[PDB]
Short mmCIF file of C-alpha atoms and ligand atoms in Angstrom, two decimals:
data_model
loop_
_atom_site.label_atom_id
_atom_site.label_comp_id
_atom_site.label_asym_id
_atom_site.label_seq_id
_atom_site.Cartn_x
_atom_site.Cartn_y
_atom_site.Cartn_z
CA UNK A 1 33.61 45.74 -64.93
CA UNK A 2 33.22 42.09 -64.20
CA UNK A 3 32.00 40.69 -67.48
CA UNK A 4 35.43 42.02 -68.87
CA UNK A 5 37.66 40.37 -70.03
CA UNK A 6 34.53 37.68 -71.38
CA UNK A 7 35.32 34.05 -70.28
CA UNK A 8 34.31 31.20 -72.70
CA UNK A 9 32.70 28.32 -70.92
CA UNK A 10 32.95 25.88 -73.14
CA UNK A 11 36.69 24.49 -73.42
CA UNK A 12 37.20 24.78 -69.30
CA UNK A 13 33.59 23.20 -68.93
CA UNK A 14 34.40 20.48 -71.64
CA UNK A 15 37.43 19.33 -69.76
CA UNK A 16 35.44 19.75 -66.30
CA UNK A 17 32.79 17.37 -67.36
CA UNK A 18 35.34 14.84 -67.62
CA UNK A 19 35.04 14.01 -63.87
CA UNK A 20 31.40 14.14 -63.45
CA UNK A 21 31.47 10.68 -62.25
CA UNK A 22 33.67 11.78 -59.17
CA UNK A 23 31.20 14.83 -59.09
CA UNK A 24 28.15 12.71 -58.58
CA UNK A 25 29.65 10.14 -56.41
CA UNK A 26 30.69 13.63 -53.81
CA UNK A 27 27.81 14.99 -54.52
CA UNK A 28 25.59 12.44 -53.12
CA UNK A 29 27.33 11.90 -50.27
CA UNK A 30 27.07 15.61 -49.53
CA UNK A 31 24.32 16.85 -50.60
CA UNK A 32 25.13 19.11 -52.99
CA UNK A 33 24.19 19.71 -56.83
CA UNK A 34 26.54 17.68 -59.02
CA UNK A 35 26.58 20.83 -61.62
CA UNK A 36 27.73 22.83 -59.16
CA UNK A 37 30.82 20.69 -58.51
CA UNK A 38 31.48 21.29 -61.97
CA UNK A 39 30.80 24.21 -62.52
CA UNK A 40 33.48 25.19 -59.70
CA UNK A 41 35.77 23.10 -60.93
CA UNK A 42 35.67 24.42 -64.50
CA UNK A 43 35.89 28.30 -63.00
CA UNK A 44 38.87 27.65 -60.87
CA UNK A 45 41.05 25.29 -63.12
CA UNK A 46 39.23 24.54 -66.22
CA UNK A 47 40.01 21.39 -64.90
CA UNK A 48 43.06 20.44 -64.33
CA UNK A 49 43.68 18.16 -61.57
CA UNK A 50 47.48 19.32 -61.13
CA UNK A 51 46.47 23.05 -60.64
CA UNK A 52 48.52 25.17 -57.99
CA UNK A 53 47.81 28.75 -57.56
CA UNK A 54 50.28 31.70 -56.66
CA UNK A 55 47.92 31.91 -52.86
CA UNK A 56 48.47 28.01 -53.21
CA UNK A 57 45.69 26.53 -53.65
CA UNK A 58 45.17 23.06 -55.26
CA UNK A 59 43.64 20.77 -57.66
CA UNK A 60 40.46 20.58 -59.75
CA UNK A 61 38.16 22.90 -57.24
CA UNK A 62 41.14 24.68 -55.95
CA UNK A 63 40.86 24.16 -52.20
CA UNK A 64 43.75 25.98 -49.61
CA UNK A 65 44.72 23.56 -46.90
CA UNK A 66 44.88 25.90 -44.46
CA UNK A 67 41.36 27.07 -44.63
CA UNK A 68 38.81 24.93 -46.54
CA UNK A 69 41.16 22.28 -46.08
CA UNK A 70 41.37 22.52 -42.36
CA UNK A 71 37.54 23.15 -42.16
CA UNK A 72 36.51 19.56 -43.90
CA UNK A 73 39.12 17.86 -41.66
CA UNK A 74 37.65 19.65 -38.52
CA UNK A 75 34.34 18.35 -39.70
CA UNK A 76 34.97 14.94 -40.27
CA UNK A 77 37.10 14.76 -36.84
CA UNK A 78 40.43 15.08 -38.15
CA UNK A 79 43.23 17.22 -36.50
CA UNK A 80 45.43 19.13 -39.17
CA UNK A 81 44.74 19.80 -42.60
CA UNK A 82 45.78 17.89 -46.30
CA UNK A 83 48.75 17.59 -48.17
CA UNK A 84 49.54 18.83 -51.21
CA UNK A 85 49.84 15.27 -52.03
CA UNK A 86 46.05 14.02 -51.37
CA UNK A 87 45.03 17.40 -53.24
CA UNK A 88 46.25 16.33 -56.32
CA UNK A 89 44.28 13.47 -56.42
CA UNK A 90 40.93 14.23 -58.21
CA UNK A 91 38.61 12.20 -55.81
CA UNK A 92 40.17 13.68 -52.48
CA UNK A 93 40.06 16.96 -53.76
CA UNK A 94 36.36 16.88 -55.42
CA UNK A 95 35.13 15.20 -51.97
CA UNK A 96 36.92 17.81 -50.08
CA UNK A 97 35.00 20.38 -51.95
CA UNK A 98 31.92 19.49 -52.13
CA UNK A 99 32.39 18.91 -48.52
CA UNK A 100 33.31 22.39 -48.16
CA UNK A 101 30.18 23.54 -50.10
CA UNK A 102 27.98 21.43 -47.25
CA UNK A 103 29.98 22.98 -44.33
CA UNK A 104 28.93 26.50 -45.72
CA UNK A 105 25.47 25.21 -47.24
CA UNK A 106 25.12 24.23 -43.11
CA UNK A 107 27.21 26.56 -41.20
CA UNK A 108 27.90 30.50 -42.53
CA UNK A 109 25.04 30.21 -44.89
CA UNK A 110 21.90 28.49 -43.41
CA UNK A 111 18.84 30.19 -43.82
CA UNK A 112 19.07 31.01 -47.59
CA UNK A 113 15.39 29.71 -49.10
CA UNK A 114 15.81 31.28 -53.03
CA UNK A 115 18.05 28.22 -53.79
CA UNK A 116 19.32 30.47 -57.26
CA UNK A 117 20.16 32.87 -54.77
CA UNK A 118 21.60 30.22 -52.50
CA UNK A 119 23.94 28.98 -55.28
CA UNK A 120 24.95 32.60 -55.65
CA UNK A 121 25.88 32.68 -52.45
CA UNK A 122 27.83 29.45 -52.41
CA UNK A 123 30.32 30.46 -55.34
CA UNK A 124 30.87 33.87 -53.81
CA UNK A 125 31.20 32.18 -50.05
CA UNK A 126 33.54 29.59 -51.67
CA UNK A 127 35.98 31.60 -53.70
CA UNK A 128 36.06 34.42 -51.42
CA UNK A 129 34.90 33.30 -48.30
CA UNK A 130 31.73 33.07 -46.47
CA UNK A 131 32.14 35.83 -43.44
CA UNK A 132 33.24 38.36 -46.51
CA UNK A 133 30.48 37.77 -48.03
CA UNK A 134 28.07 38.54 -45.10
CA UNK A 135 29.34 41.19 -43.79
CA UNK A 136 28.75 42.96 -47.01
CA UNK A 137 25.27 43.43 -45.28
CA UNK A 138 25.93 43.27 -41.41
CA UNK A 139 28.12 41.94 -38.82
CA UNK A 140 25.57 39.91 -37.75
CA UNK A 141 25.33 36.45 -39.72
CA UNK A 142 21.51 36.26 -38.73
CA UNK A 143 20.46 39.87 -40.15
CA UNK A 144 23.13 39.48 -42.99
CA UNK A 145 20.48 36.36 -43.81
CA UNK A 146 17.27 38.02 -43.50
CA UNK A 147 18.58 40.58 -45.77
CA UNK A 148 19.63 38.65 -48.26
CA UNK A 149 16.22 37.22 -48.27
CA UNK A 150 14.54 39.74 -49.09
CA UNK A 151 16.52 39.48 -52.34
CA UNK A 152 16.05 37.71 -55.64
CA UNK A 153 19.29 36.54 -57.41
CA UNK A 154 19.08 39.98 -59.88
CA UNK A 155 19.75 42.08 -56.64
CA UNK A 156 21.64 40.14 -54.67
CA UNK A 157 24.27 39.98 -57.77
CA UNK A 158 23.68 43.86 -57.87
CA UNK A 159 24.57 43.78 -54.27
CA UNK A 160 27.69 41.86 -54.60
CA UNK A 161 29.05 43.89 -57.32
CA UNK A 162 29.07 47.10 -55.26
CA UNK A 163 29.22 46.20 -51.21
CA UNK A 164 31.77 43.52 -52.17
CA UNK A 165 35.46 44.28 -51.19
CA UNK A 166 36.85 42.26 -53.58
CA UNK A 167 36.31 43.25 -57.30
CA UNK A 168 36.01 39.25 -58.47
CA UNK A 169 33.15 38.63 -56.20
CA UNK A 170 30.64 39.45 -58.94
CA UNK A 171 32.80 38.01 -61.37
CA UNK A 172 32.25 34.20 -60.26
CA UNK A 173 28.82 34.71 -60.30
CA UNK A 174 29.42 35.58 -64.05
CA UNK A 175 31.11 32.96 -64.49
CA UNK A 176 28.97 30.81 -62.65
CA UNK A 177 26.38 31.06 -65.55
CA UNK A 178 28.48 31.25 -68.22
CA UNK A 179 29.40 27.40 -66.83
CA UNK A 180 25.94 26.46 -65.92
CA UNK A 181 24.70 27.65 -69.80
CA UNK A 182 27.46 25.67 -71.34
CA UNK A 183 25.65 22.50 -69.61
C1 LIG B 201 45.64 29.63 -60.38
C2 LIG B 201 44.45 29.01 -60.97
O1 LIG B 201 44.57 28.05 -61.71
N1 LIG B 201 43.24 29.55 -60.71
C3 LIG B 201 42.95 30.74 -59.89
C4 LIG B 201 42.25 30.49 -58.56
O2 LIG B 201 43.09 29.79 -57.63
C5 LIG B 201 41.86 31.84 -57.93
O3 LIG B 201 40.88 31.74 -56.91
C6 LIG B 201 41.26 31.16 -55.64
O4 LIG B 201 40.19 30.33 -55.23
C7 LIG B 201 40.35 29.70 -53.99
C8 LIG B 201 39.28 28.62 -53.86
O5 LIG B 201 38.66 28.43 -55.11
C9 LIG B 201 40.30 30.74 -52.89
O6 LIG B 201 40.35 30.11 -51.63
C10 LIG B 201 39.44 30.67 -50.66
O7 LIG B 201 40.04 31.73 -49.97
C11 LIG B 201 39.19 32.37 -49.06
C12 LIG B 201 39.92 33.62 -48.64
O8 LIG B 201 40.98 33.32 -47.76
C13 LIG B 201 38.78 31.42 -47.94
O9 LIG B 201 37.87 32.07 -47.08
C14 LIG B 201 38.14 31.79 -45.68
O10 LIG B 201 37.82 30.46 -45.34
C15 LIG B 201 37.97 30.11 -43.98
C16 LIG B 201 37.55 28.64 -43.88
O11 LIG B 201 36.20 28.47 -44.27
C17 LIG B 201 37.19 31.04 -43.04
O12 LIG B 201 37.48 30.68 -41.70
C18 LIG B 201 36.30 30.14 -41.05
O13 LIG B 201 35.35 31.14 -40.75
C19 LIG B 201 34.08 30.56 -40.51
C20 LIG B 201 33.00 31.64 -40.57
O14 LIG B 201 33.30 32.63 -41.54
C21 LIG B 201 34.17 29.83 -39.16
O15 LIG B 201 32.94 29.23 -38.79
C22 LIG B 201 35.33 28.80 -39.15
O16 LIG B 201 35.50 28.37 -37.82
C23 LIG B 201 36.64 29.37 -39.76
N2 LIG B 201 37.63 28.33 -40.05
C24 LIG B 201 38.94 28.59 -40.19
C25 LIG B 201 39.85 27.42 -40.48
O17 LIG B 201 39.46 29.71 -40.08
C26 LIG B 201 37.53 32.51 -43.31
O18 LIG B 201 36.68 33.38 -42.59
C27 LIG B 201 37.35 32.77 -44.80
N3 LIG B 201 37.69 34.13 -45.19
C28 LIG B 201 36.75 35.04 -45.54
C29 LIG B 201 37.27 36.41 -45.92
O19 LIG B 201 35.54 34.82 -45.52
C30 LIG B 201 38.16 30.15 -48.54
O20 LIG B 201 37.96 29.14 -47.56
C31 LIG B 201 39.02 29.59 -49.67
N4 LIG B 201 38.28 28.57 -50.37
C32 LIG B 201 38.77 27.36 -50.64
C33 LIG B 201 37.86 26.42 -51.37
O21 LIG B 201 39.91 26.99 -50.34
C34 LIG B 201 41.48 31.69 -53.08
O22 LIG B 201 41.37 32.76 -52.16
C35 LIG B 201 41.58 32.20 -54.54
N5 LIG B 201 42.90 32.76 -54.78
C36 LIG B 201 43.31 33.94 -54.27
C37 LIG B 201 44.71 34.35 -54.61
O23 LIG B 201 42.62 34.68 -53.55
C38 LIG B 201 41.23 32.80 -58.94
C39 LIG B 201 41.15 34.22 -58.41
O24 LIG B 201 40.33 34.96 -59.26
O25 LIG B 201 41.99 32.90 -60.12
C40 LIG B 201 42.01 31.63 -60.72
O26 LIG B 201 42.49 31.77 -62.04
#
Protein backbone atom coordinates (compact mmCIF):
# COMPACT_ATOMS: atom_id res chain seq x y z
CA UNK A 1 0.00 0.00 0.00
CA UNK A 2 0.83 3.65 -0.14
CA UNK A 3 2.01 4.38 3.37
CA UNK A 4 4.81 1.74 2.54
CA UNK A 5 7.77 2.24 2.41
CA UNK A 6 7.06 5.27 5.45
CA UNK A 7 8.62 8.64 4.36
CA UNK A 8 10.15 10.87 7.13
CA UNK A 9 9.21 14.48 6.74
CA UNK A 10 11.45 16.02 8.62
CA UNK A 11 15.07 16.08 6.91
CA UNK A 12 13.37 16.80 3.17
CA UNK A 13 11.03 19.44 4.96
CA UNK A 14 14.06 20.91 6.97
CA UNK A 15 15.99 21.57 3.83
CA UNK A 16 12.61 22.75 2.00
CA UNK A 17 12.01 25.43 4.51
CA UNK A 18 15.15 26.89 3.52
CA UNK A 19 13.46 28.78 0.61
CA UNK A 20 10.37 29.88 2.26
CA UNK A 21 11.25 33.35 1.46
CA UNK A 22 11.05 32.53 -2.39
CA UNK A 23 7.85 30.53 -1.32
CA UNK A 24 6.09 33.53 0.08
CA UNK A 25 7.26 36.02 -2.36
CA UNK A 26 5.42 33.24 -5.35
CA UNK A 27 2.96 32.68 -3.27
CA UNK A 28 1.59 36.06 -3.05
CA UNK A 29 1.80 36.83 -6.33
CA UNK A 30 -0.26 33.73 -7.08
CA UNK A 31 -2.39 33.13 -4.76
CA UNK A 32 -1.53 30.17 -3.38
CA UNK A 33 -0.67 28.83 0.29
CA UNK A 34 3.03 29.36 0.97
CA UNK A 35 3.03 25.75 2.88
CA UNK A 36 1.94 24.27 0.06
CA UNK A 37 4.90 25.47 -2.02
CA UNK A 38 6.83 23.76 0.46
CA UNK A 39 5.39 21.15 1.08
CA UNK A 40 5.72 20.22 -2.81
CA UNK A 41 8.94 21.09 -2.90
CA UNK A 42 10.03 18.92 0.04
CA UNK A 43 7.92 15.74 -1.60
CA UNK A 44 9.49 16.02 -4.97
CA UNK A 45 13.22 16.89 -4.12
CA UNK A 46 13.58 17.26 -0.48
CA UNK A 47 14.84 20.26 -1.78
CA UNK A 48 17.33 20.36 -3.87
CA UNK A 49 17.41 23.02 -6.34
CA UNK A 50 19.69 20.93 -8.87
CA UNK A 51 17.17 17.97 -8.99
CA UNK A 52 16.63 16.16 -12.48
CA UNK A 53 14.42 13.23 -12.70
CA UNK A 54 14.72 10.05 -15.03
CA UNK A 55 10.98 11.63 -16.92
CA UNK A 56 13.16 14.92 -16.64
CA UNK A 57 11.81 16.99 -14.64
CA UNK A 58 13.57 19.86 -12.77
CA UNK A 59 14.46 21.74 -9.76
CA UNK A 60 13.06 22.30 -6.27
CA UNK A 61 9.12 21.57 -7.26
CA UNK A 62 10.11 19.41 -10.10
CA UNK A 63 8.31 21.01 -13.03
CA UNK A 64 8.58 19.20 -16.90
CA UNK A 65 9.02 21.87 -19.52
CA UNK A 66 7.03 20.36 -21.81
CA UNK A 67 3.90 20.32 -19.82
CA UNK A 68 3.69 22.51 -16.68
CA UNK A 69 6.38 24.33 -18.16
CA UNK A 70 4.66 25.10 -21.39
CA UNK A 71 1.33 25.74 -19.50
CA UNK A 72 2.81 28.84 -17.23
CA UNK A 73 4.46 30.22 -20.40
CA UNK A 74 1.09 29.90 -22.35
CA UNK A 75 -0.40 31.76 -19.45
CA UNK A 76 1.75 34.52 -19.08
CA UNK A 77 1.84 35.00 -23.09
CA UNK A 78 4.93 33.33 -23.85
CA UNK A 79 5.46 31.00 -26.91
CA UNK A 80 7.67 27.84 -26.03
CA UNK A 81 8.50 26.48 -22.84
CA UNK A 82 11.86 26.88 -20.20
CA UNK A 83 15.19 25.73 -20.25
CA UNK A 84 16.75 23.52 -18.23
CA UNK A 85 18.82 26.45 -17.46
CA UNK A 86 16.07 28.91 -15.84
CA UNK A 87 14.79 25.62 -13.97
CA UNK A 88 17.65 25.37 -11.99
CA UNK A 89 17.32 28.55 -10.62
CA UNK A 90 15.26 28.37 -7.35
CA UNK A 91 13.12 31.59 -7.92
CA UNK A 92 12.15 30.69 -11.66
CA UNK A 93 11.34 27.38 -10.77
CA UNK A 94 9.29 28.12 -7.36
CA UNK A 95 7.36 30.98 -9.44
CA UNK A 96 6.80 28.58 -12.18
CA UNK A 97 5.15 26.30 -9.75
CA UNK A 98 3.19 28.00 -7.85
CA UNK A 99 2.08 29.39 -11.07
CA UNK A 100 1.21 26.04 -12.13
CA UNK A 101 -0.77 25.40 -8.88
CA UNK A 102 -2.99 28.79 -9.89
CA UNK A 103 -3.46 27.57 -13.53
CA UNK A 104 -5.03 24.30 -12.06
CA UNK A 105 -6.49 26.10 -8.79
CA UNK A 106 -8.34 28.25 -11.98
CA UNK A 107 -8.56 26.02 -14.88
CA UNK A 108 -8.99 21.85 -14.43
CA UNK A 109 -9.97 22.33 -10.87
CA UNK A 110 -12.43 25.26 -10.26
CA UNK A 111 -15.30 24.52 -8.37
CA UNK A 112 -13.66 22.66 -5.41
CA UNK A 113 -15.28 24.53 -2.04
CA UNK A 114 -13.70 21.89 0.89
CA UNK A 115 -10.36 23.78 0.51
CA UNK A 116 -8.62 20.38 2.54
CA UNK A 117 -10.13 18.63 -0.17
CA UNK A 118 -9.01 21.24 -2.65
CA UNK A 119 -5.36 20.89 -1.53
CA UNK A 120 -5.87 17.18 -2.04
CA UNK A 121 -6.70 17.71 -5.22
CA UNK A 122 -3.89 20.08 -6.10
CA UNK A 123 -0.96 17.59 -5.08
CA UNK A 124 -2.64 14.74 -6.91
CA UNK A 125 -3.50 17.23 -10.10
CA UNK A 126 0.14 18.43 -9.85
CA UNK A 127 2.20 15.30 -9.64
CA UNK A 128 0.03 13.33 -11.78
CA UNK A 129 -1.91 15.58 -13.67
CA UNK A 130 -5.16 17.25 -13.44
CA UNK A 131 -7.41 15.46 -16.38
CA UNK A 132 -6.10 11.96 -14.61
CA UNK A 133 -7.29 12.92 -11.80
CA UNK A 134 -10.88 13.76 -12.97
CA UNK A 135 -11.59 11.32 -14.94
CA UNK A 136 -11.23 8.99 -12.07
CA UNK A 137 -14.96 10.10 -11.64
CA UNK A 138 -16.23 11.13 -15.21
CA UNK A 139 -15.23 12.40 -18.47
CA UNK A 140 -16.90 15.31 -17.82
CA UNK A 141 -14.74 17.99 -15.79
CA UNK A 142 -18.12 19.60 -14.51
CA UNK A 143 -19.72 16.23 -13.02
CA UNK A 144 -16.12 14.99 -12.08
CA UNK A 145 -16.53 18.41 -9.72
CA UNK A 146 -19.85 17.95 -8.33
CA UNK A 147 -18.78 14.59 -7.35
CA UNK A 148 -15.99 15.34 -5.72
CA UNK A 149 -18.06 17.67 -3.73
CA UNK A 150 -20.00 15.65 -2.31
CA UNK A 151 -16.80 14.38 -0.67
CA UNK A 152 -14.87 15.22 2.47
CA UNK A 153 -11.03 14.81 2.25
CA UNK A 154 -11.41 11.05 4.17
CA UNK A 155 -13.28 9.85 0.96
CA UNK A 156 -11.96 11.59 -1.58
CA UNK A 157 -8.37 10.07 -0.43
CA UNK A 158 -10.35 6.68 -0.30
CA UNK A 159 -11.35 7.49 -3.78
CA UNK A 160 -7.98 8.21 -5.08
CA UNK A 161 -6.44 5.19 -3.71
CA UNK A 162 -8.71 2.83 -5.67
CA UNK A 163 -10.17 4.72 -9.07
CA UNK A 164 -6.63 6.13 -9.47
CA UNK A 165 -4.54 4.59 -12.37
CA UNK A 166 -1.49 5.35 -10.99
CA UNK A 167 -0.54 3.57 -7.66
CA UNK A 168 1.42 6.98 -6.23
CA UNK A 169 -1.65 9.05 -6.51
CA UNK A 170 -2.63 8.30 -2.92
CA UNK A 171 0.80 8.28 -1.96
CA UNK A 172 1.38 12.23 -2.31
CA UNK A 173 -1.47 12.79 -0.44
CA UNK A 174 0.43 10.77 2.29
CA UNK A 175 3.02 12.53 1.92
CA UNK A 176 1.35 15.65 1.72
CA UNK A 177 0.61 15.40 5.53
CA UNK A 178 3.44 13.84 6.59
CA UNK A 179 5.06 17.46 5.21
CA UNK A 180 2.31 19.62 6.42
CA UNK A 181 2.71 17.83 10.24
CA UNK A 182 6.40 18.38 10.16
CA UNK A 183 5.44 22.29 9.93
C1 LIG B 1 13.73 12.30 -9.23
C2 LIG B 1 13.33 13.07 -8.04
O1 LIG B 1 14.17 13.70 -7.42
N1 LIG B 1 12.05 13.01 -7.64
C3 LIG B 1 10.94 12.24 -8.25
C4 LIG B 1 9.86 13.06 -8.95
O2 LIG B 1 10.36 13.70 -10.13
C5 LIG B 1 8.71 12.12 -9.36
O3 LIG B 1 7.51 12.78 -9.66
C6 LIG B 1 7.43 13.56 -10.89
O4 LIG B 1 6.73 14.75 -10.58
C7 LIG B 1 6.52 15.62 -11.66
C8 LIG B 1 6.06 16.97 -11.10
O5 LIG B 1 6.25 16.98 -9.71
C9 LIG B 1 5.53 14.99 -12.62
O6 LIG B 1 5.22 15.90 -13.66
C10 LIG B 1 3.82 15.94 -14.00
O7 LIG B 1 3.53 14.99 -14.98
C11 LIG B 1 2.18 14.92 -15.32
C12 LIG B 1 2.04 13.67 -16.17
O8 LIG B 1 2.57 13.86 -17.45
C13 LIG B 1 1.71 16.22 -15.96
O9 LIG B 1 0.32 16.14 -16.22
C14 LIG B 1 -0.02 16.70 -17.52
O10 LIG B 1 0.10 18.10 -17.53
C15 LIG B 1 -0.28 18.75 -18.73
C16 LIG B 1 -0.07 20.25 -18.47
O11 LIG B 1 -0.86 20.70 -17.39
C17 LIG B 1 -1.72 18.41 -19.15
O12 LIG B 1 -1.99 19.02 -20.39
C18 LIG B 1 -3.00 20.05 -20.25
O13 LIG B 1 -4.29 19.51 -20.05
C19 LIG B 1 -5.15 20.49 -19.52
C20 LIG B 1 -6.41 19.81 -18.94
O14 LIG B 1 -6.11 18.55 -18.38
C21 LIG B 1 -5.44 21.51 -20.63
O15 LIG B 1 -6.33 22.52 -20.22
C22 LIG B 1 -4.13 22.09 -21.20
O16 LIG B 1 -4.45 22.81 -22.37
C23 LIG B 1 -3.04 21.01 -21.45
N2 LIG B 1 -1.71 21.58 -21.68
C24 LIG B 1 -0.72 20.90 -22.31
C25 LIG B 1 0.59 21.61 -22.47
O17 LIG B 1 -0.83 19.75 -22.76
C26 LIG B 1 -1.92 16.88 -19.21
O18 LIG B 1 -3.28 16.56 -19.41
C27 LIG B 1 -1.45 16.29 -17.89
N3 LIG B 1 -1.56 14.83 -17.85
C28 LIG B 1 -2.49 14.19 -17.11
C29 LIG B 1 -2.46 12.69 -17.17
O19 LIG B 1 -3.35 14.77 -16.45
C30 LIG B 1 2.03 17.40 -15.04
O20 LIG B 1 1.81 18.64 -15.66
C31 LIG B 1 3.47 17.33 -14.52
N4 LIG B 1 3.63 18.29 -13.46
C32 LIG B 1 4.64 19.16 -13.41
C33 LIG B 1 4.66 20.09 -12.24
O21 LIG B 1 5.53 19.24 -14.27
C34 LIG B 1 6.16 13.72 -13.18
O22 LIG B 1 5.20 13.04 -13.96
C35 LIG B 1 6.73 12.82 -12.06
N5 LIG B 1 7.64 11.84 -12.63
C36 LIG B 1 7.24 10.78 -13.35
C37 LIG B 1 8.33 9.89 -13.87
O23 LIG B 1 6.07 10.52 -13.63
C38 LIG B 1 8.31 11.15 -8.24
C39 LIG B 1 7.42 10.03 -8.74
O24 LIG B 1 6.89 9.36 -7.63
O25 LIG B 1 9.44 10.50 -7.68
C40 LIG B 1 10.25 11.48 -7.10
O26 LIG B 1 11.20 10.84 -6.27
Amino acid sequence: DYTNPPWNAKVPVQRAMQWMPISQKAGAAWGVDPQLITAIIAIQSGGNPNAVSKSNAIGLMQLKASTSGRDVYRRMGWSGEPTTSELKNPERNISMGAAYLNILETGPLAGIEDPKVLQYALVVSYANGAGALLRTFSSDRKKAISKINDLDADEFLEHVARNHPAPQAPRYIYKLEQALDAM
